Amino acid sequence: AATLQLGQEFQLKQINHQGEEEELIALNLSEARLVIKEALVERRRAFKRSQKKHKADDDDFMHSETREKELESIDVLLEQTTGGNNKDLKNTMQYLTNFSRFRDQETVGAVIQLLKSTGLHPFEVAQLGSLACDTADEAKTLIPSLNNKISDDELERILKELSNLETLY
Amino acid sequence: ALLVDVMTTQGGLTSVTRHGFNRSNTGALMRCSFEETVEILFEAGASAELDDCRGVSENVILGQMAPIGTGAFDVMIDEESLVKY
Amino acid sequence: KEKAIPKDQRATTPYMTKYERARILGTRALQISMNAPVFVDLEGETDPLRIAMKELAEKKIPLVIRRYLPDGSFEDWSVEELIVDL
Amino acid sequence: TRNSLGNVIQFIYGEDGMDAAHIEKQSLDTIGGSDAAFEKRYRVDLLNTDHTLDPSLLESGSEILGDLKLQVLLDEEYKQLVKDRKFLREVFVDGEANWPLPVNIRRIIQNAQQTFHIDHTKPSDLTIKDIVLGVKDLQENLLVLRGKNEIIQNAQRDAVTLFCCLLRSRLATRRVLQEYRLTKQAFDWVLSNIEAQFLRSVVHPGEMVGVLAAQSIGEPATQMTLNTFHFAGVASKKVTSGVPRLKEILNVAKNMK
Amino acid sequence: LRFGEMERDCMIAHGAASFLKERLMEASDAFRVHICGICGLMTVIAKLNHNQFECKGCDNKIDIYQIHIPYAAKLLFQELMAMNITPRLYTDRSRDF
Amino acid sequence: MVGQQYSSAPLRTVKEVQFGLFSPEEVRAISVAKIRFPETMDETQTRAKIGGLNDPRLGSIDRNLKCQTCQEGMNECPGHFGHIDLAKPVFHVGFIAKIKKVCECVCMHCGKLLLDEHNELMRQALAIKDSKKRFAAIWTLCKTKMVCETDVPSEDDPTQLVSRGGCGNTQPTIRKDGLKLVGSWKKDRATGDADEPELRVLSTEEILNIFKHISVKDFTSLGFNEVFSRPEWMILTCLPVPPPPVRPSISFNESQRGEDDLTFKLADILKANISLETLEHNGAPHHAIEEAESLLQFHVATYMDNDIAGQPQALQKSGRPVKSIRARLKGKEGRIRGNLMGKRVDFSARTVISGDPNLELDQVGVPKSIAKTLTYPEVVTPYNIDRLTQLVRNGPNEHPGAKYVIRDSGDRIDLRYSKRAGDIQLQYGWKVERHIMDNDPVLFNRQPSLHKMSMMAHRVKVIPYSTFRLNLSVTSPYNADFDGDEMNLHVPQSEETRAELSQLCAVPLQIVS
Amino acid sequence: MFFIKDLSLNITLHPSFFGPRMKQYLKTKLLEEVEGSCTGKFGYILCVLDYDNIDIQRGRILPTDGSAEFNVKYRAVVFKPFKGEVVDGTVVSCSQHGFEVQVGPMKVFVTKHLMPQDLTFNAGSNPPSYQSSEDVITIKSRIRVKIEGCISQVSSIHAIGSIKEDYLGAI
Amino acid sequence: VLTCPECKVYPPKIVERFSEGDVVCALCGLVLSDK
Asked: How does the entry describe the domains (chain B)?
């Protein structure tokens, strides 16, 4: 999408099941990983509630000490929620976990606020949330849409602030 | 009564031949079914004619279920009664 | 969903034709022969058609007939509420 | 009745919406006969000695005589019968009485007489009010079209006109009390059976009537060839009829023989 | 044995569509054909082992449909198309595209 | 469950059939092999020549090798189309009359309609929605204007002349001689020349050029379409080549291939095309070019229709006429009336009848062997697995018995060769193809089937000997006696079909005609 | 690229599952068939939202086999790139012709003609990699690839990208 | 080449049933190609 050619299937204006126009939603690695983790843990909780109906521990999964412990919790979650029949989901989740720029929800919200305060395109915002660039020109070349649309000083400020926001591992 | 009403429904006397029925507005395959096949096909092609596939002959050519008696309706599942049991 | 007629404005016959009866019996016999659950007290019968007739007798077939008007609209009638002559 | 394109060929199949196998030959008794026979058969008068009901027929025959509402009802019934005679003579100008129609009322009445062991030698417990109101209500409960606007109402009355005429012809008060001698139980049974047997004669939606009509017309056309040349037995009657005449009718030939 | 036109008409008179469909297609000649969703023709090339579906003329690899038709209907369509006529099969819900 | 394979394309049902015409662009794009040689198979006489009539990219009909384009067996390859390029355009034998009629209705020089909106008659013609009558009226009106009018009186004032851009030239009168379209110019008497209409054979390329110049409003007015039915396409430039499925070769032996007539005609077409091409580039005299073009037109015309009026019939080397494409479809035994409205079927029998006064009204006696040949696919369930197991143990040489066992996956085991009559264990959902057993519904008829009551349902009873049995009261609806009549038996193969035969067509329900 | 879309599917339920718990079987069928799939029209099917809010439609018993077909609509998060897209990813395998980069669930290949000559292939290194004056790219090295084209089949989508211009390589 | 996918015996033993339009392995009775 160098020229923002998203096609009909991925138009900026989306028609939902309610028939009202909505802005197209784009999520980076951190947002998508958090959303899928939340959905999986909610589904696990629903499954446990259903099993209790037919017939505490969940706080430790979301709060992970380390990357390896997070990966182990992810494997347990996939075993207990997915069944192990979906390898592509495991690969995507591993790719999200290994290269997640931001682990905490509040920091991800800060990144979202910083990127979308200027009102840029959701594609550019998600790309900036996915890519960490040292210099504004590096991002502008690697994101041709950002060219001619954002001042270099603003892009440099955003990139430096994002680099500062990265939580040390 | 039905035969007579069919023969005189277009405002005039329409004979039961190719000139009366095969020159009607019905579907292309239906009309080409008997006695003027290739010429009707040629004319339909040249005029860019659209067939609707609702008559018996069009559903016999395509190997489908015509809306004929038992085929005039759809059978669907009612969830309310199924759950009630 | 504009085509569907409200239940109060239904203007079709409240009896069920012979074609609808034959279609319903065939569908139920096929489903029974494909190991579907039986809703009545089977008593020594081993033929899906006869069990279909038996279920029809107590009005327990959970199916709905959709009737197509010529314009395109349709009318929904449950098998329970259709009068069957004997 | 429509076709594949949706064009209406008939606004009702057969103009009465009846199946072709639920129809038998029945005679309309109002058309034929002289005025004297009609007057004697169908007229009942509670004030003139000429046309009274014999009290040995009706259980309450003694008290009813001289009443006022009853004679008004009987007068309305007789006016209806007169209008029916006029209309029926307007339709069939030849004066013929036997036409095909649904429901064999004669067999229903005979079954009512045979099942209940009705003895004609005893008075019956019927009431004129009950007979008249029952016949009118049964007419009210005959349905082929179930619309709600006025158009469908007019169409349905037009459909059931002739059957209502026959029904009025057979169930007249004097005919019931003097010819059949039905009781209350048998009368209720007859009305219920008539309604039930009528409601099962309507045509079933989904029937392919075009191929039925074509087969019905063209099956006797195959055997028609044999006896076409019977008019060939008259040399001075060399008029086209039979296979060539049907051929010319179908082709809509512009030069007849 | 020949199941002629008179037999078909009698079965239509009775009103048994399912018997007609079973006699016509399942008992004589049933065929499965892939058709293009844009031009509505039988030109789609399908490699079933690798499930590679391609329409060369219209550059289509997504909108491709499976249809169950007799074999004589396919022969008739091909013979019609061999004389520069286009019988273009379309689907119920292809008006959206 | 047709194809014995799996595909991820969704199943759908045909709703519309939009006819039309190929553009040469479409014929080129669709095709995968430009046919080039008048030969089919190589000089080694073992494989087909690449680029010939039997190019492997089109497909194969044989059951050993698979198609090069799709790598599928002969039971799954539909067939792919070739194309042949023509030196000069050729008239299509099926639109000569329409071409001439639309030619007489349009100016031969400016390429525009002889009339416009000013005339009231044009308003009347353009008020009609029916294309056929519209074109007929426009033709019968505009066939008589041999000169294009430069100026037309105005509707508001007849004295005011408005120019419509007409060229003002004189249109000819066109007649048809065989496959040729010959025009005659009637020069104006004011020119001083005699009233002798100069005759000339109109060239197809000029007519094509004239038709290509027509506009969209005239497209709609004439009765054509912009997308599907342009008139320029009515003149052939490229000829599609049908795959070998359409023209199957019958091989008696390994080196004995009798080819179809259609491929011989196509080979002759290509031979004539290459001859005309090699004379075209050699600077031959105009007479030879005209003769070669006439021969090419004759071959292309008689390839599709071989019954053209007023011409000789293209004959085969043995003297028989060449069966064109039209003769395939037009007959009573052709595709429409012989392979699409009625066709031969499976699971059926035919035998003489007899009378049995001990049978019930709606019961038919079926011979033993005919009961041993036809089958029924019963589904194994908890209610029948014991009887079905005993039936499988019985085998195919004993009645009752079974003949095949279908698994859940579609595989089918022949019980005769598989020793496992006493070995196969049945599960839920498998199918046993068992013999036809007492009280199975069948359909039964006699030809000709003139009316509804000549095709009725019955319940079977298995009997010895070779005749069918009937009650002596159903012989009236069938118009049948027992001096040699044979009737036909058809077996349903499902539960819905069995219910239809038992609740609609039964003999008890057919008494009051 | 991650996006939220509205999807629908037709699911056939076998007659042997016709009971009061049909909704549970439909939900299990949907979850087991849809999640993790790939469709060329919408890319890989990553996840489905609002599992409790699954929309359902009335059954329509097929006239040929008795299996009830249902139409199910839902909202899903999916991944699909576009021409000219630039994405970060992880090097999977190293070859002389170029390299392969995993991005999300997909693979984008780059041919040696699509990088500047400053990046030279080193085979003696363990593992073999591409070495330049400033950027070194190897296994588990974050690399930005500008996707140039994509090929879509039934079950997967492959991609081909180029890094021929500046500001590409190791980050 | 046409081989039984269950017996896995080379060379395969195969009998063609012409009167039924079938190709049948002569050991397991499996039906290979129809029509």
From this structure: The C-terminal domain (CTD) serves as a platform for assembly of factors that regulate transcription initiation, elongation, termination and mRNA processing.
